[PDB]
Amino acid sequence: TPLYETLNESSAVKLGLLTCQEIGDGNLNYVFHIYDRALIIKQAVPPLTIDRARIESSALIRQGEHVPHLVPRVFYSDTEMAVTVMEDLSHLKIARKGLIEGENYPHLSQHIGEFLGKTLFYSSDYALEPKVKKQLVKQFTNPELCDITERLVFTDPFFDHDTNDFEEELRPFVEKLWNNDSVKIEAAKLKKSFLTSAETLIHGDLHTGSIFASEHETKVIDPEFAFYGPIGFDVGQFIANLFLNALSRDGADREPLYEHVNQVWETFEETFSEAWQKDSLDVYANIDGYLTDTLSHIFEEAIGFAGCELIRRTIGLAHVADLDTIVPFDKRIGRKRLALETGTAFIEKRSEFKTITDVIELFKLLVK
Amino acid sequence: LYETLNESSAVALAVKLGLFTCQEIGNLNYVFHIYRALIIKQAVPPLTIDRARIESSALIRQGEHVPHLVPRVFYSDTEMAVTVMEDLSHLKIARKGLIEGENYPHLSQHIGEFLGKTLFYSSDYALEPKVKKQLVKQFTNPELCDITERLVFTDPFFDHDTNDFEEELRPFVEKLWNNDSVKIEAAKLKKSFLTSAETLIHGDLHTGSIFASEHETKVIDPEFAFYGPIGFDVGQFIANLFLNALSRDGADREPLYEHVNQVWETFEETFSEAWQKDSLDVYANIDGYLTDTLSHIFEEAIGFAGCELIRRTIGLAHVADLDTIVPFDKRIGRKRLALETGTAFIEKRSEFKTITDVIELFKLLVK
Numbered sequence: 001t002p003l004y005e006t007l008n009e010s011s012a013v014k015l016g017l018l019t020c021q022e023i024g025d026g027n028l029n030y031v032f033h034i035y036d037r038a039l040i041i042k043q044a045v046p047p048l049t050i051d052r053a054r055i056e057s058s059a060l061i062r063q064g065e066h067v068p069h070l071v072p073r074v075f076y077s078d079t080e081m082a083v084t085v086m087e088d089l090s091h092l093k094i095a096r097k098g099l100i101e102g103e104n105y106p107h108l109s110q111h112i113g114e115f116l117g118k119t120l121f122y123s124s125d126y127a128l129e130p131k132v133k134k135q136l137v138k139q140f141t142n143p144e145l146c147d148i149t150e151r152l153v154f155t156d157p158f159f160d161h162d163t164n165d166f167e168e169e170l171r172p173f174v175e176k177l178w179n180n181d182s183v184k185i186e187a188a189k190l191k192k193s194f195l196t197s198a199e200t201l202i203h204g205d206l207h208t209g210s211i212f213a214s215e216h217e218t219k220v221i222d223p224e225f226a227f228y229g230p231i232g233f234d235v236g237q238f239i240a241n242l243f244l245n246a247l248s249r250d251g252a253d254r255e256p257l258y259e260h261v262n263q264v265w266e267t268f269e270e271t272f273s274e275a276w277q278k279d280s281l282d283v284y285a286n287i288d289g290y291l292t293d294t295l296s297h298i299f300e301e302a303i304g305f306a307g308c309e310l311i312r313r314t315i316g317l318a319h320v321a322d323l324d325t326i327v328p329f330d331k332r333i334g335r336k337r338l339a340l341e342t343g344t345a346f347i348e349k350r351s352e353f354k355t356i357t358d359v360i361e362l363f364k365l366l367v368k
Numbered sequence: 369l370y371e372t373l374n375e376s377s378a379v380a381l382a383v384k385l386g387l388f389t390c391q392e393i394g395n396l397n398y399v400f401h402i403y404r405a406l407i408i409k410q411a412v413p414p415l416t417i418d419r420a421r422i423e424s425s426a427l428i429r430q431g432e433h434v435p436h437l438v439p440r441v442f443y444s445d446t447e448m449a450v451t452v453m454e455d456l457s458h459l460k461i462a463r464k465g466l467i468e469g470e471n472y473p474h475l476s477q478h479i480g481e482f483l484g485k486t487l488f489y490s491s492d493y494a495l496e497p498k499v500k501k502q503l504v505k506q507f508t509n510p511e512l513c514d515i516t517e518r519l520v521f522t523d524p525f526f527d528h529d530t531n532d533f534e535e536e537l538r539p540f541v542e543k544l545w546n547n548d549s550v551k552i553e554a555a556k557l558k559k560s561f562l563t564s565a566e567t568l569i570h571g572d573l574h575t576g577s578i579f580a581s582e583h584e585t586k587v588i589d590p591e592f593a594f595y596g597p598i599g600f601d602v603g604q605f606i607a608n609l610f611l612n613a614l615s616r617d618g619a620d621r622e623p624l625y626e627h628v629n630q631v632w633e634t635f636e637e638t639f640s641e642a643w644q645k646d647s648l649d650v651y652a653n654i655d656g657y658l659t660d661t662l663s664h665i666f667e668e669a670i671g672f673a674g675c676e677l678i679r680r681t682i683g684l685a686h687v688a689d690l691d692t693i694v695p696f697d698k699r700i701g702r703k704r705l706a707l708e709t710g711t712a713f714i715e716k717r718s719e720f721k722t723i724t725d726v727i728e729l730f731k732l733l734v735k
């Protein structure tokens with residue numbers, strides 16, 4: 001008989017680990033805080049299969065094997081119940097919220113860069129026997145959550161589709177995008193890579209709202225969207241959300257975010273490189289120029305994906321607080337115009353950039 | 369459940385199934401011909417017998433789109449590792465025919481159509497991505513992919529135990545081993561083989577996986593099928609046309625060069641028609657998108673062709689086209705050319721503009 005039952009505060013409060021409050025922001029997932037000493041119980045609500053909870057638990061445990069300091073500990077998980085029992089991180093702040101409040105989080109980019117480099121390297125064919133990796137591909141296939149992304153980041157913003165949500169003051173600029181054949185061709189190629197390039201186990205939703213942060217600590221959460229896809233993807237989505245915060249700031253306040261974009265690519269590239277040297281199984285790994293060309297391709301896709309995330313967050317179904325809370329209204333429109341414009345340039349020009357500072361310097365010029 | 373068959377128990381299965389003397393005409397796979405006639409193929413246990421599930425499933429899928437270009441499957445069973453199929457012994461394996469000097473005028477149109485349709489119709493272009501992600505699971509082929517990952521993409525390029533080549537070839541083989549830039553390129557193509565889950569491929573589409581006569585073509589043995597790069601079956605087939613060209617002299621080569629041009633042309637035209645007609649992709653009709661898609665397939669196809677050319681010359685698994693060339697010295701010379709053309713194909717793959725450029729490069733090198 002079926003064993004799933006949607007939890008409540010009492011039901012959540014037998015595993016051998018006095019008061020409980022549901023603190024979930026969304027509505028697809030319940031998050032139960034139990035308090036001593038504290039604990040979190042996350043549970044999927046059923047339209048999206050509850051299978052996502054199996055993916056999420058498994059992804060967190062996997063990430064913990066390589067970067068246990070950058071992810072919450074998982075004490076228990078259950079597939080039928082769609083439950084993940086994990087470490088309480090309420091003493092930290094969601095990074096998107098903190099950044100909007102003016103926190104700079106000096107280590108954010110070192111920490112995320114390390115997370116990206118290790119997670120993305122160690123689940124790849126570089127690191128794993130291909131026969132092992134092919135099994136992990138099966139275990140982490142995520143059709144419904146991939147469908148969300150395939151539509152929202154890669155498809156809907158580029159056409160007059162019903163999921164989009166944007167001010168009419170933006171219509172002229174949005175229609176300029178829709179009519180742009182060559183940027184759309186490129187977004188199709190990026191989407192095709194998303195659909196087909198089973199390179200590693202990615203997080204699949206690594207924006208600033210999926211990170212807990214304080215001055216000295218960083219933790220990545222909510223790998224619901226995990227599956228075998230392109231290595232550049234998590235890197236692009238994260239970098240884009242740094243740029244999205246930049247656009248919500250003015251003048252010299254932007255500098256910390258530009259430094260984070262630079263630092264996260266750099267740390268990613270070092271971390272991925274050191275893991276490659278020390279732990280690759282490939283006979284081809286140590287041939288001069290092979291790692292270099294591999295990183296150049298990741299870099300290029302990462303910038304393309306960033307462009308998609310920049311556009312998608314601005315005019316698509318799922319927005320970001322960074323742009324939506326900008327005041328006054330006319331400034332909001334202007335900054336949302338620029339996210340559209342930079343995202344487009346990112347997509348079009350992705351293979352012309354040589355370094356991360358090329359990308360930052362282009363961005364800075366477009367947002368002057 | 370599983371029991372390896374013999375000629376007698378193979379006859380018993382045929383009658384038990386309600387269909388219709390027996391000889392095993394196949395070291396890993398038995399093929400039982402039963403005479404109205406019928407074929408019963410069975411996997412033997414080191415390599416998983418799960419390959420027989422993949423082969424039967426692949427043949428049935430291919431039959432949905434090109435039923436005239438694959439044998440009919442009357443019955444299959446996973447636990448017995450059995451595929452019961454149409455008898456094609458009135459046809460000749462294409463490799464054998466081509467070596468005897470048969471030219472098979474329609475071979476390239478038939479395979480071009482096979483390629484275009486099979487490769488389009490199991491892709492994200494043709495299928496709901498949710499459906500396609502299920503087929504990826506179903507066709508995951510770790511052991512047979514491992515053979516390819518090692519034999520076509522890795523061992524030939526290093527001093528590995530599986531390679532098998534004449535000592536007279538050593539200088540040219542060592543030239544390849546010491547070539548960093550071709551090997552970087554071979555790595556990229558391998559990485560694509562390992563990661564690019566674009567469509568359901570045959571995975572072993574050489575001239576010995578084809579039955580042929582003047583008027584008929586049938587593709588067989590899709591044991592190696594899995595979700596991989598679209599360019600792969602195209603490259604491996606083109607390379608085996610070039611391998612036969614090298615076993616011929618002078619003007620007798622021209623039919624093979626025509627086959628290479630024709631198979632790309634037919635492939636490109638079939639894939640294009642299927643794209644216009646049957647794509648699910650909102651991006652499908654934007655001018656330049658199909659064109660750029662084909663350019664990438666072309667480039668990979670040519671790279672994979674170079675790997676197959678090298679691999680068949682000096683790796684574990686050879687081709688009769690090269691190994692039966694006489695005299696010995698001529699053999700060494702032509703095997704040197706396969707190595708050098710395969711190398712050129714890998715390194716120049718993104719410089720070619722059309723199939724004619726590929727052929728004209730090849731013809732120049734083998735003058």
Ligand SMILES: Nc1ncnc2c1ncn2[C@@H]1O[C@H](COP(=O)(O)OP(=O)(O)O)[C@@H](O)[C@H]1O
Nearest residue numbers: 023024025026029031040072087088089090222
């Ligand atoms: N481990 C945790 N510790 C403390 N709070 C958490 C924890 N996990 C989630 N939360 C709270 O619940 C919110 C929703 O978490 P998240 O995993 O992103 O759910 P969803 O998938 O619904 O977005 C977070 O923004 C955070 O405020």
Ligand SMILES: Nc1ncnc2c1ncn2[C@@H]1O[C@H](COP(=O)(O)OP(=O)(O)O)[C@@H](O)[C@H]1O
Nearest residue numbers: 393394397399407439454455456457461588589
């Ligand atoms: N459908 C068939 N009709 C007639 N002969 C066949 C048929 N299938 C296979 N054979 C014979 O058996 C041989 C091996 O078949 P194949 O499917 O290539 O097995 P393997 O996977 O061992 O290469 C073929 O070359 C052919 O001579």
Ligand SMILES: [Mg+2]
Nearest residue numbers: 209210221222
């Ligand atoms: Mg979240």
Ligand SMILES: [Mg+2]
Nearest residue numbers: 029222223224
């Ligand atoms: Mg989530």
Ligand SMILES: [Mg+2]
Nearest residue numbers: 576577588589
């Ligand atoms: Mg065979």
Ligand SMILES: [Mg+2]
Nearest residue numbers: 397572589591
């Ligand atoms: Mg076979």
